[PDB]
Design a protein that fits this description.
Length: 339
Amino acid sequence: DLRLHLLLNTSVTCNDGSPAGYYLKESRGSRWLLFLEGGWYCFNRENCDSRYDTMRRLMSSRDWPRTRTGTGILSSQPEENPYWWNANMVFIPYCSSDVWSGASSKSEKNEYAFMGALIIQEVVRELLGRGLSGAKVLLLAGSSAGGTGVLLNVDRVAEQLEKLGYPAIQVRGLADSGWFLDNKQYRHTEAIRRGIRYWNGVVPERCRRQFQEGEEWNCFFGYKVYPTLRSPVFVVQWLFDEAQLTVDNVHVQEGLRLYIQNLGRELRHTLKDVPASFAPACLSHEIIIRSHWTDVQVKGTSLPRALHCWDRSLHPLKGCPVHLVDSCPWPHCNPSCPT
Ligand SMILES: Oc1c(C[NH+]2CCOCC2)ccc2ccccc12
Ligand SMILES: *[C@@H]1O[C@H](CO)[C@@H](O)[C@H](O)[C@H]1NC(C)=O
């Protein structure tokens, strides 16, 4: 169980103005995993109002429970988490509906607050007083919108710790199911463009400088923002991601067969030069906090093993690979895919 702490700076809020927060389980014998929850987003007054009605835990802390059970990479049991079972564990709930990009308070012109980028900054600052000041490695991880959130925020956390005087903490990222293609749909980007303006969204500075004003939406797509990042980032992405297919209007004859095979090939291509990555040929979505995340393998290597090999590479390795991408071209051509 991880224990809830609401932020002491009550000006850093969820969408409805309630305080944001984090769930923490300390491990005093260890020198930190900070996980960003996902859950889509909203981009105007009308669809944010709908989300407040039936997805309110993603917009408010008013009904959060006092504890959460750590699962998958957040579990403290070696049988469930061979990778980092002894680490300090943090779960940051997603209550800003902005893909963790926003920096805008609720005001007399704004019905909702969109503060995802500032929530991450404030969690880091308050954790430094609870033990993070002594850390050797801070791994910023996340699933779905939280995985895109890692890509948008990992270099800002690194800069924050450097400016605060902690140059010895190594900041790294782990992006799960947050690597999308802005491709042609099977049946018939504007929502991101509108969302960024609604949220006052912020993107990493080197990427912003490349694409310039009005084109910041580009930095939400992994294959465009990743080359601009300085922190080490491990990318986990199913080749046939269910959220990607939903946006593509896919739910089998020749036209759809070719569409699906082309999607897998394009995703494989975007990862060819990503040295730390794990990309199985499965139809699924998210994995790192699922309890059975230890089951899937690529070329004989599990995801917990690949992450352990990544740790060793940051001190190629014999029998300990870090770049693992399936080549077979159809969902479940990998026998270890989730049923
Ligand atoms: O915008 C898209 C997404 C989701 N976006 C959400 C926010 O961050 C980045 C990805 C997924 C598939 C898409 C396919 C084609 C065009 C746009 C797409
Ligand atoms: C609380 O957070 C806001 C927004 O980031 C910031 O402007 C303010 O300085 C913070 N308060 C303190 C005491 O640091």
